[PDB]
Design a protein around this ligand. Structure first.
Ligand SMILES: *[C@@H]1O[C@H](CO)[C@@H](O[C@@H]2O[C@H](CO)[C@@H](O[C@@H]3O[C@H](CO[C@H]4O[C@H](CO[C@H]5O[C@H](CO)[C@@H](O)[C@H](O)[C@@H]5O[C@H]5O[C@H](CO)[C@@H](O)[C@H](O)[C@@H]5O)[C@@H](O)[C@H](O[C@H]5O[C@H](CO)[C@@H](O)[C@H](O)[C@@H]5O)[C@@H]4O)[C@@H](O)[C@H](O[C@H]4O[C@H](CO)[C@@H](O)[C@H](O)[C@@H]4O[C@H]4O[C@H](CO)[C@@H](O)[C@H](O)[C@@H]4O[C@H]4O[C@H](CO)[C@@H](O)[C@H](O)[C@@H]4O)[C@@H]3O)[C@H](O)[C@H]2NC(C)=O)[C@H](O)[C@H]1NC(C)=O
Ligand SMILES: *[C@@H]1O[C@H](CO)[C@@H](O[C@@H]2O[C@H](CO)[C@@H](O[C@@H]3O[C@H](CO[C@H]4O[C@H](CO[C@H]5O[C@H](CO)[C@@H](O)[C@H](O)[C@@H]5O[C@H]5O[C@H](CO)[C@@H](O)[C@H](O)[C@@H]5O)[C@@H](O)[C@H](O[C@H]5O[C@H](CO)[C@@H](O)[C@H](O)[C@@H]5O)[C@@H]4O)[C@@H](O)[C@H](O[C@H]4O[C@H](CO)[C@@H](O)[C@H](O)[C@@H]4O[C@H]4O[C@H](CO)[C@@H](O)[C@H](O)[C@@H]4O[C@H]4O[C@H](CO)[C@@H](O)[C@H](O)[C@@H]4O)[C@@H]3O)[C@H](O)[C@H]2NC(C)=O)[C@H](O)[C@H]1NC(C)=O
Ligand SMILES: *[C@@H]1O[C@H](CO)[C@@H](O[C@@H]2O[C@H](CO)[C@@H](O[C@@H]3O[C@H](CO[C@H]4O[C@H](CO)[C@@H](O)[C@H](O[C@H]5O[C@H](CO)[C@@H](O)[C@H](O)[C@@H]5O)[C@@H]4O)[C@@H](O)[C@H](O[C@H]4O[C@H](CO)[C@@H](O)[C@H](O)[C@@H]4O)[C@@H]3O)[C@H](O)[C@H]2NC(C)=O)[C@H](O)[C@H]1NC(C)=O
Ligand SMILES: *[C@@H]1O[C@H](CO)[C@@H](O[C@@H]2O[C@H](CO)[C@@H](O[C@@H]3O[C@H](CO[C@H]4O[C@H](CO)[C@@H](O)[C@H](O[C@H]5O[C@H](CO)[C@@H](O)[C@H](O)[C@@H]5O)[C@@H]4O)[C@@H](O)[C@H](O[C@H]4O[C@H](CO)[C@@H](O)[C@H](O)[C@@H]4O)[C@@H]3O)[C@H](O)[C@H]2NC(C)=O)[C@H](O)[C@H]1NC(C)=O
Ligand SMILES: OCCc1ccc(O[C@]2(CO)O[C@H](CO)[C@@H](O)[C@@H]2O)c(O)c1
Ligand SMILES: OCCc1ccc(O[C@]2(CO)O[C@H](CO)[C@@H](O)[C@@H]2O)c(O)c1
Ligand SMILES: OC[C@H]1O[C@@](CO)(OCCc2ccc(O)c(O)c2)[C@@H](O)[C@@H]1O
Ligand SMILES: OC[C@H]1O[C@@](CO)(OCCc2ccc(O)c(O)c2)[C@@H](O)[C@@H]1O
Ligand SMILES: *[C@@H]1O[C@H](CO)[C@@H](O)[C@H](O)[C@H]1NC(C)=O
Ligand SMILES: *[C@@H]1O[C@H](CO)[C@@H](O)[C@H](O)[C@H]1NC(C)=O
Ligand SMILES: *[C@@H]1O[C@H](CO)[C@@H](O)[C@H](O)[C@H]1NC(C)=O
Ligand SMILES: *[C@@H]1O[C@H](CO)[C@@H](O)[C@H](O)[C@H]1NC(C)=O
Ligand SMILES: *[C@@H]1O[C@H](CO)[C@@H](O)[C@H](O)[C@H]1NC(C)=O
Ligand SMILES: *[C@@H]1O[C@H](CO)[C@@H](O)[C@H](O)[C@H]1NC(C)=O
Ligand SMILES: *[C@@H]1O[C@H](CO)[C@@H](O)[C@H](O)[C@H]1NC(C)=O
Ligand SMILES: *[C@@H]1O[C@H](CO)[C@@H](O)[C@H](O)[C@H]1NC(C)=O
Ligand SMILES: *[C@@H]1O[C@H](CO)[C@@H](O)[C@H](O)[C@H]1NC(C)=O
Ligand SMILES: *[C@@H]1O[C@H](CO)[C@@H](O)[C@H](O)[C@H]1NC(C)=O
Ligand SMILES: *[C@@H]1O[C@H](CO)[C@@H](O)[C@H](O)[C@H]1NC(C)=O
Ligand SMILES: OCCc1ccc(O)c(O)c1
Ligand SMILES: OCCc1ccc(O)c(O)c1
Lengths: 624, 624
């Protein structure tokens, strides 16, 4: 095992455990100290204003198992500190018959048991577990724990009748899944159900959704309501909130609804952020965010989706969320988005970016797997004065359209996503910022033009505004993590409406994934404009490439170039001519970003362990 | 619910939980503070000379489940003190994937991990578990924990490769069971195997047996040897120590070997107690004690047995224990005998006496189930100068015979059992002792003759020596827990060699068992004697009746008379005449015994709880 990054990589499978720990590792984002991580969980803003973030964690292993809550906190979403207790950075772990198979995803009741922050989580026990298996009742239940020390530790309710688990009966037979309880308050749903509370007797101020589906018949999001305010044991099943068909797709802009939901949440937004009105705010929109499984050929069969919904009240005192329009939260290698309320009328969302090493070839050599996305403010994106000649505008696929009185302009509404401003300010202020001169890409443009200032390492951000002619057939974008021999190309092609990440040359190491990423982006053309504009921002963070377009489209992916000098960046141009010109302006490079874990040393590996021959006997976890 | 014990019992199933807690409860023996108990476990003499006793425990329930080690200690086997920690009187409980289904029976390595007392125990996980089910590998494994505070708490080794569980591979396929590891030192087995240690590489000073069997092919006791002295992770399977046939019986004196062994142990005894020689002591005998299942029509299909064995060394460096003669450790409602070494060359044995409420009719009303037997010294019982005309003497069924040179007398050898002298001394010294006049039972004997002094409550001991003619057809014995309307009759019938306990009138409460208990007793006739003698001792302790005959035969059973005055005792006589006389002498009543738990109040119930609907979903425990 040579770690010489000035020559071609050897056979890196001969390298020892965690010998590649720092090589490709993100530094500017949320990531576990070591080992396996997946979904964010237990997210809440604490009483002191700081953010508590949990995550599905399996320390000292590089595959999933014994899944536990790891945790950390931050005053600004950006610089983090690990909890450190009797179980290291873990704060909840399998310990009881009802959760011994795994402490799955859960969410926070901020004023819960005895007034303390309380987590409702999926407690898993023995038996087949999965949407393509014959799962039985009891294997996935929902349980409570509360914290008296602001998340340093959690105390579970006792096992038994009238205690944990608190939700265990399946609401319908033959479920594909029954997990990821999302607890939320909703003046909107309270107002809608107020006339029906005699029917169900559920009058509490908290709601909870549970994610799943029905065998052969598509995904389901099940709605529960807390039975009585101030009491947390009894949750009354109302009915299915979202019902979709077996591998139903709303279309090209909307992924696929698969066979089963995971990590679903419910929110209400307006143009400024979170909306806490009862329906009276006409600018507010109800949204559901959700993962789907087995509706995709790649990306581990997973889509992270969202839908704008219109609520209808059923005669039995339940709510049907009718999908109005439907989109994608991130088009790349990310999943398990969780959102939570933040002071100042914000709803903040964060997901999990998985690696691109599906065959587990270098996972032990890394000594870790997984990271978070950046934290994102959600809001209703509104585009005014949209030209009706915008191609495809009235499909209304992942957006709504509203005509002006005279029919000559349109107001477009969709889900907005942007990186939280605390992170952008910290990144910029800690970086070496280079403000670059605008560039016209014409007949003289090379295929690749390096920026006049270059990154110094694999931790940087780029931004640029690309102005295209309305009938362009040119392509443009950014190349990142680039040397002569390795590079990753981010292209936008307005004629096809496709944002792609081409990774055929991303790395000399052939075991990592090299498939092309794709997102659809609609450039809403403005009345009177003779051009259309793509604002593209890219974060490069170790192996993470996280792309944002027009505060709307997100695409997270991975690139693992071997060579030490594969860090460069610049502009891409294809089919630009004297007549078909792409104007690039607002160009800026931020080199360095932020050290997101200042108390951590560079190498926080504690080694890896094997569970031994019993792992295969129990059959629950891979064991490593 | 009336608790008026001066009138007939009502419908006692209407009584609340633990309302009958003190009514039938033993006071003079080892018993849990409340709830379910079964097998003794983790027995050892601590460094200060006190005795540590563990037991299978399920607090606040009256059926088995979440099975844990409850524990207590005593300086004299007789007066006990509960441990009290974070889990009350529990000291080991299900907590890890490998033991979450139950912390089953285990035994003590006195100088174990880091020099501390260490328990090797059966750690159980998910799946079918039982001799009549299709159990798989992993469901029962063997794990270590050690104590740094003399049994107040135990620390388990970590889960994983080279740690817990330490024994998990099945030594043969299709096992009926794989549990109850019994760890022991044996100069005898070391000496026998010394010439074969090149074959196996196992040279440690501890051995361990694991109890089980093979589907369709009878029970097995598997022998392991510690691989290396001072190291406790690696245990090398040598081979089957005891192999018996599917429901094989050695005969009427020997119970039945069933289909599977439980709680088996290995010891070496001589006439004084424990023998620690290497084979050089010609008076010493190797014994195996073991439970068998599914070889009995009643008594919950369980026999607690023992066998004298002769060890043979196999060519592969293992030991075959060849059964020389085979007997019964207790003929009544007891099981799960554990034995352990005690200073002064003693081996002490103790078992579990179950209730006689198989249909679970009044278990909740009790608020507890189960107790221990008394603690018993084991030794080789030797009877000299036995007459060869003793009927059946040369069947050698549960004994051996050795002729004198002249063939006119015989030395009989068998397993001896007697109550530990510490308990007998404490019982007698704390009791009101009545020494009774000898009685000849002849033509004038009533069927029942009360003793001249009577017990004052349900806590007493009796003793008597019954002298019979060599061709008697008379019967005699003791009646206990007796009023006019309720009584329990203990008879010996020398013509049939049957000691019986007739329980047809034991209680007015009809839900308790009333079947007749039976033990075989051989009266070894002495050369020149014109009579044969039965020394019979009976302990009455709440509902326990525990009978000992000739320091050899033990029979534990239950009687639950309702009436407050059903406490009397006296002599029984049947078919005694002027010519067929039974002489009774050495008669003594000890009224009161000892309060075995002086720190406990009378009612130590903490109520009962239900596990809720998930108990049936998981399917592992009854849930109450
Ligand atoms: C199989 O058997 C298993 C083992 O028995 C069993 O698991 C056990 O289940 C029981 C029963 O559910 C659990 O008991 C509960 O424990 C809760 C506390 O849990 C936390 O703390 C304990 C104890 O912590 C001490 O000890 C440890 C270990 O040494 C130390 O690390 C600690 O520092 C601490 O040490 C101090 O105290 C020691 C003695 O206790 C001293 O020795 C020492 O010197 C120190 O001073 C921990 O062990 C727990 O850890 C475990 O669990 C966590 C998850 O929770 C895991 O992460 C971890 O790995 C461990 O597994 C944990 O940290 C108690 O709160 C709880 O008691 C409440 O509930 C019951 C009702 O069920 C009531 O009877 C009781 O009165 C309590 O309720 C009151 O309190 C709260 C307020 O605090 C109220 O919400 C409630 O309404 C009520 O209020 C009352 O009082 C109010 C105020 O006065 C009043 O106003 C009200 O009106 C009202 O009257 C209960 O005891 C036990 O933790 C489990 N143990 C383990 C190891 O798992 C398992 O379930 C069984 N399985 C099956 C299938 O049956
Ligand atoms: C799924 O995830 C689960 C959760 O992660 C996981 O379970 C956990 O597994 C890990 C790994 O196996 C366990 O970690 C071990 O813990 C042992 C100690 O266990 C006891 O103590 C802990 C901690 O107790 C503190 O905290 C609790 C809780 O607050 C308090 O109640 C205590 O009072 C105590 O508090 C003090 O300390 C705190 C911080 O630690 C402070 O906050 C506080 O202020 C106090 O000061 C308890 O939690 C344990 O309870 C649990 O387990 C018991 C059963 O054991 C249950 O009954 C109970 O209900 C709980 O479930 C328990 O009481 C450690 O000894 C052990 O560390 C040794 O082993 C590892 C090797 O594996 C070494 O890395 C390490 O160095 C240690 O080895 C050395 O030490 C011993 C000597 O002591 C030697 O034998 C050994 O050779 C070695 O010696 C070294 O040092 C020598 C001297 O210097 C030197 O000479 C030698 O040469 C050598 O170098 C390890 O940390 C963890 O307990 C589990 N936790 C739980 C909750 O279950 C589960 O396995 C996972 N499942 C799967 C399927 O993967
Ligand atoms: C005395 O001790 C017992 C523990 O043994 C305490 O708890 C009770 O245990 C018994 C089992 O011994 C439970 O009986 C079972 O009940 C279920 C149905 O229960 C439902 O209906 C009840 C009647 O109103 C109700 O009390 C229950 O409410 C509890 O449970 C829910 C969770 O489901 C929880 O949310 C509540 O807060 C309560 O904790 C519940 O709604 C029944 O299906 C079982 O039937 C089987 O067994 C019986 C007997 O053989 C048989 O007849 C059936 O055919 C079937 O085989 C079983 O009857 C009882 O529910 C428990 N009660 C509780 C927890 O309140 C009991 O509390 C102790 N008493 C006191 C005064 O302390
Ligand atoms: C690096 O990190 C790993 C954790 O990932 C550390 O532990 C090793 O993990 C790997 C899995 O990643 C284990 O590989 C498996 O090994 C078994 C066979 O193991 C046996 O033979 C080994 C070779 O000598 C030996 O080391 C093992 O000894 C350990 O385990 C026993 C208990 O069985 C215990 O008593 C000992 O004390 C040791 O702890 C053992 O005897 C093999 O069956 C597995 O095969 C599967 O997977 C591979 C890979 O896909 C495949 O090729 C097979 O076809 C099959 O699919 C697997 O190879 C390895 O055994 C673990 N080694 C240990 C625990 O020592 C590792 O230690 C870390 N290294 C360092 C230097 O820290
Ligand atoms: O829910 C997202 C799907 C997903 C994606 C990758 C996984 O992750 C990787 C990425 O290459 O694939 C491997 C699993 O085959 C895993 O070792 C690795 O971390 C995974 O466990 C779930
Ligand atoms: O291993 C001894 C067999 C045995 C005997 C009785 C049991 O015990 C009793 C006694 O009536 O039977 C009942 C089980 O049906 C149990 O509630 C009760 O304690 C038991 O669980 C195992
Ligand atoms: O770590 C768990 C969290 O990860 C999520 C989101 O990816 O997916 C469940 C993944 C999963 C794990 C084990 C299985 O047997 C299975 O079929 C699917 C959540 O649904 C969940 O709470
Ligand atoms: O509490 C356990 C201890 O009790 C013993 C002795 O009676 O028997 C096992 C009883 C048993 C429990 C659960 C089962 O599924 C089963 O088939 C038998 C031991 O073998 C053991 O360690
Ligand atoms: C980068 O490193 C490679 C390999 O060491 C070298 O060939 C190349 O000239 C370097 N510089 C580049 C590609 O700009
Ligand atoms: C790389 O090394 C592995 C052993 O880890 C070996 O199996 C594989 O064939 C090697 N690949 C080569 C030499 O290309
Ligand atoms: C309410 O009605 C809906 C629509 O038929 C149904 O799916 C749901 O199960 C009902 N809720 C109940 C029975 O609680
Ligand atoms: C909206 O405007 C477009 C363009 O003028 C027109 O084709 C369409 O019919 C209008 N829709 C409505 C509902 O008026
Ligand atoms: C650098 O980042 C830190 C950590 O997020 C932040 O608090 C600080 O304000 C930043 N420095 C600037 C903007 O100068
Ligand atoms: C015992 O009590 C019963 C019922 O109260 C009574 O009939 C009887 O006379 C009493 N004394 C006896 C049986 O010696
Ligand atoms: C005793 O009470 C139970 C209720 O616990 C009842 O079912 C049974 O029939 C009663 N037996 C009688 C009255 O004999
Ligand atoms: C014993 O105590 C328990 C628990 O407090 C109580 O429910 C029960 O009625 C008591 N029984 C007696 C006989 O005092
Ligand atoms: C040793 O031989 C015996 C007798 O055939 C056999 O039962 C046992 O399994 C053998 N031991 C091994 C293979 O370790
Ligand atoms: C033992 O003694 C009996 C009675 O004298 C006799 O029948 C038997 O043959 C003797 N056995 C041996 C082995 O000498
Ligand atoms: C009474 O019993 C106690 C407890 O076992 C014992 O220590 C004491 O010696 C006994 N009293 C006597 C024999 O007088
Ligand atoms: O096909 C869209 C035709 C059209 C309708 C109204 C407009 O204002 C427009 O610019 C184009
Ligand atoms: O049947 C036993 C005959 C017998 C042999 C030797 C004796 O010493 C005896 O008393 C009887």
């Amino acid at each position: 095992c040579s770690l010489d990054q000035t020559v071609a990589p050897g056979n890196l499978t001969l390298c020892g455990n965690a010998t590649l720990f720092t090589t490709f590792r993100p530094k500017a984002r949320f990531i576990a100290p070591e080992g396996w991580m997946n979904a964010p969980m237990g997210l809440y803003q604490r009483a002191d204003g700081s953010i508590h973030a949990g995550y599905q964690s399996h320390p000292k292993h590089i595959q999933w198992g014994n899944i536990s809550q790891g945790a950390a906190y931050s005053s600004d979403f950006t610089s983090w500190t690990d909890f450190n207790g009797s179980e290291g950075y873990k704060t909840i772990w399998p310990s009881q018959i009802y959760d011994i198979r795994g402490v799955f995803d859960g969410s926070i009741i901020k004023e819960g048991i005895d007034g303390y922050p309380t987590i409702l989580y999926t407690s898993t026990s023995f038996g087949p577990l999965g949407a393509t298996l014959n799962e039985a009742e009891g294997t996935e239940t929902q349980s409570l724990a509360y914290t008296t020390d602001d998340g340093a530790s959690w105390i579970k309710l006792g096992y038994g009748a009238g205690q944990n688990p608190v939700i265990y009966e399946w609401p319908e037979t033959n479920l594909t899944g029954f997990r990821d309880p999302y607890v939320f308050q909703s003046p909107r749903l309270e107002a809608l159900l107020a006339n029906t509370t005699s029917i169900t007797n559920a009058t509490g101020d908290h709601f909870a959704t549970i994610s799943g589906g029905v065998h052969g018949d598509g995904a389901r999001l099940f709605l529960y309501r807390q039975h009585t305010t101030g009491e947390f044991i009894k949750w009354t099943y109302l009915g299915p909130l979202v019902t979709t068909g077996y591998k139903e797709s709303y279309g090209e802009w909307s992924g696929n609804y698969g066979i089963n939901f995971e990590t679903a949440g419910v929110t209400r937004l307006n143009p400024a952020g979170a909306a806490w009105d009862n329906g009276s705010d006409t600018t507010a929109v109800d949204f559901v965010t959700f993962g789907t499984e087995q509706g995709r050929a790649d990306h581990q069969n997973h889509w992270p989706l969202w839908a704008a919904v219109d609520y209808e009240v059923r005669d039995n005192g339940s709510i049907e969320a009718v999908i109005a329009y439907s989109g994608v939260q991130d088009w790349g290698r990310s999943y398990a988005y969780a959102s939570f309320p933040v002071e100042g009328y914000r709803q903040v969302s964060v997901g999990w970016i998985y690696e691109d090493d599906d065959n587990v070839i270098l996972a032990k050599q890394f000594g870790y797997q997984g990271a978070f996305t950046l934290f994102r403010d959600l809001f209703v994106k509104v585009v005014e004065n949209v030209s009706p000649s915008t191609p495809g505008l009235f499909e209304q696929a992942s957006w709504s359209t509203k005509n002006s009185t005279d029919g000559m302009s349109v107001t477009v509404t969709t889900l907005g996503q942007r990186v939280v401003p605390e992170t952008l300010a910290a990144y910029k202020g800690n970086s070496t910022v280079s403000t670059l001169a605008p560039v016209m890409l014409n007949e003289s443009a090379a295929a690749y033009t390096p920026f006049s200032s270059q990154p110094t390492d694999r931790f940087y951000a780029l931004t640029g505004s690309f102005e295209f002619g309305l009938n362009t057939t040119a392509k443009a974008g950014f190349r990142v993590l680039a040397s002569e021999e390795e590079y990753t190309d981010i292209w936008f092609d307005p004629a096809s409406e496709n944002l792609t990440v081409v990774r055929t040359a991303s790395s000399l190491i052939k075991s990592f994934g090299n498939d092309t990423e794709l997102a659809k982006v609609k450039l809403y053309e403005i009345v009177g404009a003779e051009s259309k504009t793509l604002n593209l921002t890219v974060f490069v963070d170790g192996s993470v490439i996280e792309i944002y377009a027009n505060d709307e489209v997100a695409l997270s992916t991975r690139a693992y170039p071997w060579l030490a000098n594969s860090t460069g960046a610049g502009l891409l141009a294809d089919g630009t001519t004297a007549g078909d010109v792409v104007g690039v302006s607002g160009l800026e490079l931020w080199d360095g970003l932020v050290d997101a874990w200042p108390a951590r040393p560079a190498n926080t590996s504690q080694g890896l362990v094997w569970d031994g021959p019993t792992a295969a006997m129990y059959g629950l976890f891979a064991g490593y």
